[PDB]
Design a binder for these strands. Sequence first.
RNA 1: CAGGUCUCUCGUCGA
RNA 2: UUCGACGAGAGA
Length: 457
Amino acid sequence: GEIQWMKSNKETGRLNINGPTRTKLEPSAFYDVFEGSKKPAVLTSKDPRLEVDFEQALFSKYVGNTLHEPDEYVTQAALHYANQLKQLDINVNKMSMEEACYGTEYLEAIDLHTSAGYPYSALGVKKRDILDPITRDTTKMKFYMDKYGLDLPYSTYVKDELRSLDKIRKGKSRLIEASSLNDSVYLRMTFGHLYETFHANPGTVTGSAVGCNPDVFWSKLPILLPGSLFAFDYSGYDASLSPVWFRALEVVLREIGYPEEAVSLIEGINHTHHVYRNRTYCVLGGMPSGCSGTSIFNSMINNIIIRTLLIKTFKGIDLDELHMVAYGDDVLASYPFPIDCLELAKTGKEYGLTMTPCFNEVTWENATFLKRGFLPDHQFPFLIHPTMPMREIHESIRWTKDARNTQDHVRSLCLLAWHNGKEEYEKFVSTIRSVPIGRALAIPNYENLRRNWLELF
RNA sequence: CAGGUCUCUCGUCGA
RNA sequence: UUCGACGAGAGA
């Protein structure tokens, strides 16, 4: 992905989208008793902690484009993935606007607690001023889709969140491309049922982990991915995607029977306009993260990428012998034979992909997925714990958006940490008990946590 | 008053 | 066990 041009809003006529510059994160009741080095991200170029120029850092991720267009390897990869998807019988029909707006069983209603995007926010219209969970009315929605059309620009904002200390001085905050309500509605209408299918089917048919629950999914993976394991992460996945991957995504959607009217929306996300503050810019390539279907499309593309890199790098691959699941850029995969990932990553560079783990042999003992390790339980080794490092839980507990959430916050971290074992857990709970606010919390005991988890099977 | 698309899990109030 | 509204945490 590559920024094509960037121009004044006075020159493009776009209303300006200016978000808040101050963080909602503040030191928690446990800032003092736990060690950590993450801080809230830089949100303005004025930030004292900055050691670089902000806006060049913010946009440095768009590292250009390479292939615009499938070679035969991309093409066979896309069709193998698309053929796999056929067993799901995805309904390529349009969703009503009412379903796109207000939800179904496997499609959540549009989130009424977040911005309505360009132009509404600059105009002071909120989603809840257009959509209504009780009436379930869509005439106000249709009116505004008529008034402002489709293919509106994405409102860029900096994500308020913790980052590593390295990424503070280097202005390496992450961007949110807020979707306009109009585009959310239209991409939900045309792809709602695909979303429904992917949400109801985490696994190795969709090749997607969206909708999994690591507590029980981790024990399912060694069955789902038999044979030898490989994996990697990517440097700046969404911004590194060249248009060829969006043209492959269109082949896949075509093969499962979408009409061209639907398939060509994908070009409307491979080619995008964004409004950051007072200036407009335009990107070719690259997934706009806040867009509808972004996690699903990124995972589909990832299935295309892996297959493409398999058959271009080695002779005599049988794609039908590949198992994989992706969650965005995160990949876990298996093949009857060990796969040289250093070689794969190299091929990935020929397509603009910067892929990252030396190339250690991937084992269940060292693999990670969704930032969790894998650790067979001692009593029952056919049941696998998702392990989250204690450093990350320590970093989390030192901050708060509202002291009213301490119990929920600390409870949620307890359910993540215990998988690291009784010793590490009791040390965690004990530090929490070392401040008065810690002593007031309801904290489960490891044995209860372990028994509850054991009973899930 | 603002700051995306989502998943899971937990909690609070109901059925 | 299941379903709705709201809040939270982690992950993508």
